[PDB]
Coordinates of C-alpha atoms in Angstrom, one line a residue:
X1 CA 14.3 -32.5 -11.6
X2 CA 15.3 -35.2 -8.8
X3 CA 16.8 -32.2 -6.9
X4 CA 13.7 -30.2 -6.8
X5 CA 11.8 -33.5 -5.7
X6 CA 14.5 -33.6 -2.9
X7 CA 14.0 -30.4 -1.5
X8 CA 10.4 -30.7 -1.7
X9 CA 10.9 -34.1 0.4
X10 CA 13.5 -32.3 2.7
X11 CA 10.9 -29.4 3.2
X12 CA 8.1 -32.0 4.1
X13 CA 10.6 -33.5 6.7
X14 CA 11.9 -29.9 8.2
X15 CA 8.4 -28.7 8.9
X16 CA 7.1 -31.7 10.0
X17 CA 4.0 -31.4 7.3
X18 CA 2.7 -32.6 4.4
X19 CA 4.0 -31.0 1.0
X20 CA 2.1 -31.1 -2.0
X21 CA 4.1 -30.1 -5.6
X22 CA 3.8 -30.1 -9.0
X23 CA 6.0 -29.0 -11.8
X24 CA 3.9 -29.0 -15.6
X25 CA 5.0 -27.9 -18.5
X26 CA 2.8 -24.9 -19.6
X27 CA 2.4 -25.8 -23.5
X28 CA 2.2 -29.1 -24.0
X29 CA 0.6 -30.2 -20.3
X30 CA 3.4 -32.7 -19.5
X31 CA 4.3 -32.9 -15.5
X32 CA 7.9 -32.7 -15.1
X33 CA 7.7 -33.4 -11.6
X34 CA 5.4 -34.5 -8.5
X35 CA 5.1 -35.4 -5.4
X36 CA 1.7 -35.8 -3.4
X37 CA -0.2 -34.9 -6.3
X38 CA -3.7 -36.1 -5.5
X39 CA -3.9 -35.2 -2.0
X40 CA -5.6 -32.4 -0.9
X41 CA -4.3 -28.9 0.9
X42 CA -6.3 -25.8 2.0
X43 CA -6.0 -23.5 -1.2
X44 CA -6.4 -20.4 1.1
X45 CA -5.9 -17.2 -1.1
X46 CA -4.9 -19.1 -4.0
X47 CA -8.4 -19.4 -4.8
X48 CA -8.7 -15.8 -5.3
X49 CA -7.7 -16.6 -8.9
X50 CA -10.0 -19.2 -9.4
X51 CA -12.5 -16.4 -8.2
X52 CA -11.4 -13.6 -11.0
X53 CA -11.4 -16.8 -13.6
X54 CA -15.0 -17.3 -12.4
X55 CA -15.4 -13.4 -12.8
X56 CA -13.8 -12.8 -16.0
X57 CA -16.1 -15.9 -17.8
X58 CA -19.3 -14.0 -16.8
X59 CA -17.2 -11.0 -18.1
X60 CA -17.0 -13.1 -21.7
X61 CA -20.8 -13.6 -21.6
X62 CA -21.5 -10.3 -20.6
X63 CA -23.2 -11.0 -17.0
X64 CA -20.4 -9.1 -16.0
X65 CA -18.6 -6.1 -16.6
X66 CA -15.3 -5.3 -15.3
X67 CA -16.2 -1.4 -15.1
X68 CA -19.2 -2.0 -13.1
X69 CA -19.0 -0.5 -9.9
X70 CA -19.9 -2.0 -6.5
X71 CA -20.4 -0.2 -3.1
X72 CA -20.2 -1.9 0.3
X73 CA -20.0 -0.8 4.0
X74 CA -17.8 -0.9 7.0
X75 CA -19.6 -3.9 8.1
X76 CA -18.8 -5.8 5.2
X77 CA -14.9 -5.3 6.1
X78 CA -13.3 -8.7 7.1
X79 CA -9.7 -8.8 8.6
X80 CA -6.8 -7.7 5.8
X81 CA -8.5 -5.5 3.7
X82 CA -5.8 -3.4 2.8
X83 CA -7.6 -1.8 -0.2
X84 CA -11.4 -1.9 0.2
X85 CA -11.1 -0.1 3.2
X86 CA -9.8 2.6 1.3
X87 CA -12.9 3.0 -0.8
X88 CA -16.0 2.9 1.6
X89 CA -17.0 6.1 -0.3
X90 CA -16.6 5.7 -3.9
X91 CA -16.7 1.8 -4.1
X92 CA -14.7 -0.3 -6.5
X93 CA -15.2 -1.7 -9.7
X94 CA -15.3 -5.3 -10.3
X95 CA -11.8 -5.0 -11.9
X96 CA -10.1 -2.8 -9.0
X97 CA -11.8 -6.1 -6.9
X98 CA -10.0 -8.5 -8.8
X99 CA -6.9 -6.5 -8.9
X100 CA -7.4 -6.1 -4.9
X101 CA -7.7 -9.9 -4.2
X102 CA -5.1 -11.1 -6.6
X103 CA -2.5 -8.0 -6.5
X104 CA -2.7 -7.8 -2.2
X105 CA -4.6 -10.6 -1.4
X106 CA -7.6 -8.5 -0.3
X107 CA -10.1 -10.5 1.8
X108 CA -12.9 -8.3 1.4
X109 CA -12.5 -7.7 -2.5
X110 CA -12.8 -11.8 -2.5
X111 CA -16.1 -11.8 -0.5
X112 CA -17.6 -9.2 -2.6
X113 CA -16.2 -11.1 -5.7
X114 CA -17.9 -14.3 -4.4
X115 CA -21.2 -12.4 -4.1
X116 CA -20.5 -11.8 -7.6
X117 CA -20.7 -14.9 -8.8
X118 CA -23.5 -16.7 -6.3
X119 CA -21.4 -17.4 -3.7
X120 CA -18.5 -20.2 -2.6
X121 CA -21.0 -23.3 -4.1
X122 CA -21.2 -21.3 -7.2
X123 CA -17.1 -20.7 -7.7
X124 CA -17.3 -24.5 -7.3
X125 CA -19.6 -25.4 -9.9
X126 CA -17.6 -23.1 -12.2
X127 CA -14.5 -25.6 -11.4
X128 CA -16.7 -28.3 -11.9
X129 CA -18.1 -27.1 -15.3
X130 CA -14.6 -26.4 -16.5
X131 CA -13.4 -29.8 -15.9
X132 CA -12.0 -29.7 -12.1
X133 CA -14.5 -32.0 -10.4
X134 CA -11.8 -32.3 -6.9
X135 CA -11.4 -28.3 -6.2
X136 CA -14.3 -27.0 -4.1
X137 CA -14.8 -23.8 -2.2
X138 CA -17.5 -23.8 0.8
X139 CA -16.5 -21.1 2.8
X140 CA -15.9 -17.3 3.0
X141 CA -12.9 -14.8 3.9
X142 CA -11.6 -15.1 6.4
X143 CA -13.0 -18.9 7.5
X144 CA -12.3 -20.5 4.5
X145 CA -8.6 -20.5 6.1
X146 CA -9.7 -22.6 9.2
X147 CA -7.1 -25.3 8.1
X148 CA -8.8 -28.5 9.7
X149 CA -7.0 -31.6 9.3
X150 CA -8.5 -33.9 7.1
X151 CA -11.6 -31.1 6.3
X152 CA -12.1 -31.7 2.5
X153 CA -13.6 -27.9 2.5
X154 CA -11.8 -25.3 1.0
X155 CA -9.1 -27.3 -1.0
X156 CA -7.4 -28.6 -4.1
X157 CA -4.8 -31.2 -5.1
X158 CA -1.9 -30.0 -6.7
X159 CA -2.8 -31.8 -9.6
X160 CA -6.0 -30.5 -10.2
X161 CA -4.8 -27.2 -9.3
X162 CA -2.3 -27.2 -11.6
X163 CA -4.7 -28.7 -14.2
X164 CA -7.3 -25.6 -13.4
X165 CA -4.4 -23.0 -13.6
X166 CA -3.1 -24.3 -16.8
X167 CA -6.9 -24.1 -18.6
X168 CA -7.8 -20.3 -17.4
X169 CA -4.3 -19.2 -18.6
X170 CA -4.0 -20.7 -21.6
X171 CA -6.9 -23.0 -22.2
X172 CA -10.3 -22.2 -24.4
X173 CA -12.3 -21.1 -21.5
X174 CA -11.8 -17.7 -21.3
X175 CA -11.4 -15.3 -24.3
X176 CA -7.5 -14.1 -25.4
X177 CA -8.4 -11.1 -23.3
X178 CA -9.6 -12.2 -19.8
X179 CA -6.9 -14.9 -20.0
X180 CA -4.3 -11.8 -20.9
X181 CA -5.9 -10.0 -17.6
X182 CA -5.7 -12.8 -15.3
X183 CA -1.4 -13.3 -15.6
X184 CA -1.6 -9.6 -15.7
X185 CA -3.1 -9.5 -12.2
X186 CA -0.8 -12.3 -11.0
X187 CA 2.5 -10.4 -12.5
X188 CA 1.4 -7.5 -10.7
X189 CA 1.8 -9.6 -7.0
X190 CA 2.8 -7.8 -4.2
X191 CA 2.8 -10.4 -1.5
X192 CA 4.8 -13.4 -2.5
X193 CA 8.2 -11.4 -2.4
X194 CA 9.8 -14.0 -0.6
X195 CA 8.6 -17.3 -2.2
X196 CA 9.5 -18.1 -5.8
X197 CA 10.4 -14.5 -6.9
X198 CA 13.3 -14.5 -4.5
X199 CA 14.8 -17.4 -6.5
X200 CA 14.3 -15.8 -9.9
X201 CA 17.0 -14.6 -11.9
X202 CA 16.6 -11.1 -13.8
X203 CA 14.6 -11.1 -17.0
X204 CA 12.2 -14.1 -16.2
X205 CA 8.7 -14.1 -16.0
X206 CA 6.4 -14.8 -13.0
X207 CA 3.0 -14.8 -12.6
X208 CA 2.2 -16.2 -9.2
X209 CA -0.7 -15.8 -6.2
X210 CA 0.2 -16.9 -2.7
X211 CA -1.6 -18.1 0.4
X212 CA -1.5 -18.4 3.8
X213 CA -3.8 -20.5 6.6
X214 CA -4.4 -21.8 9.8
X215 CA -1.8 -24.4 11.3
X216 CA 0.7 -24.1 9.1
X217 CA -0.8 -24.0 5.8
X218 CA 1.2 -21.9 2.9
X219 CA 1.0 -22.0 -0.8
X220 CA 1.3 -20.5 -4.0
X221 CA 0.4 -21.2 -7.4
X222 CA 2.8 -19.8 -10.6
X223 CA 3.4 -19.6 -14.3
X224 CA 7.2 -18.6 -14.7
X225 CA 9.6 -18.4 -17.4
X226 CA 13.1 -17.4 -18.7
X227 CA 13.2 -15.2 -21.0
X228 CA 10.2 -12.5 -20.3
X229 CA 7.7 -15.4 -21.4
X230 CA 6.3 -18.1 -18.7
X231 CA 6.8 -21.5 -19.5
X232 CA 6.3 -23.7 -16.9
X233 CA 3.3 -23.8 -14.3
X234 CA 4.5 -24.6 -10.7
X235 CA 1.6 -25.4 -8.0
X236 CA 2.9 -25.7 -4.1
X237 CA 1.5 -26.5 -0.9
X238 CA 2.0 -27.3 2.8
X239 CA -0.4 -27.5 5.9
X240 CA 0.3 -29.1 9.2
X241 CA 3.6 -27.0 10.1
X242 CA 4.3 -25.2 13.6
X243 CA 6.4 -23.5 11.6
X244 CA 6.7 -19.4 11.7
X245 CA 5.7 -17.8 8.4
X246 CA 9.2 -16.9 7.7
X247 CA 10.4 -20.4 7.6
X248 CA 7.8 -21.5 5.6
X249 CA 8.5 -18.5 2.9
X250 CA 12.2 -19.9 3.3
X251 CA 11.3 -23.5 2.5
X252 CA 9.2 -22.9 -0.7
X253 CA 12.0 -20.1 -1.8
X254 CA 14.6 -22.8 -1.2
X255 CA 12.1 -25.3 -3.3
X256 CA 12.4 -22.6 -5.8
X257 CA 15.7 -22.0 -6.4
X258 CA 16.5 -25.9 -7.3
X259 CA 13.9 -25.4 -10.0
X260 CA 15.1 -22.7 -11.0
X261 CA 19.3 -24.3 -11.3
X262 CA 17.3 -27.4 -12.8
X263 CA 15.2 -25.8 -15.3

């Protein structure tokens, strides 16, 4: 809706930074709104959803088991590891690591999971072989959050990310069970509170994953909808701003309010 597009434009002026945006019908794949759809933005922790899609594909193929337990050392722990830092002794299952990565944003979780699939280059190969030749992952946590201006490393485009999420959640790539688990992790997101969630009416479904990085980068990917079922995917990024995290959150939430209002 135009009003939504206005909010996105207004967000771009106010933050003084590029904002990318895509609305997408989940069923039909039709783009409902767009803004800078073919420009690149840092993915930040929104990559963690793609990462666990890759993991789930290995699960389907029998190269991985969700209950397989991984131990690690205190050295392995990188900045912001709220869940993995609690299990140095017992270790964590692959499923637990993906829950930590997606619901809580756990960075060491993401690194251990990257190790399981072969690293950033192999995540990119996975994305490539599912028809996303745009999105690329190059580094690990925390360095993938660097957001150097015009750096192509660790980026996606709104339209590539919207496309890839719709294929992961509803496409033929993963088994029904693995696509249910992936959206189940996203529905259980605990660190995306002040963003799109803040705009939802009671009884609306939302599965999402947010992200934040250096130089004002912020973002969220989401499959949400009225009456407890999702029906649309929204991808929203921004990088370059000098704004506080609080103002970036409020801008996203304001954009969320128009999307809802004009659903």
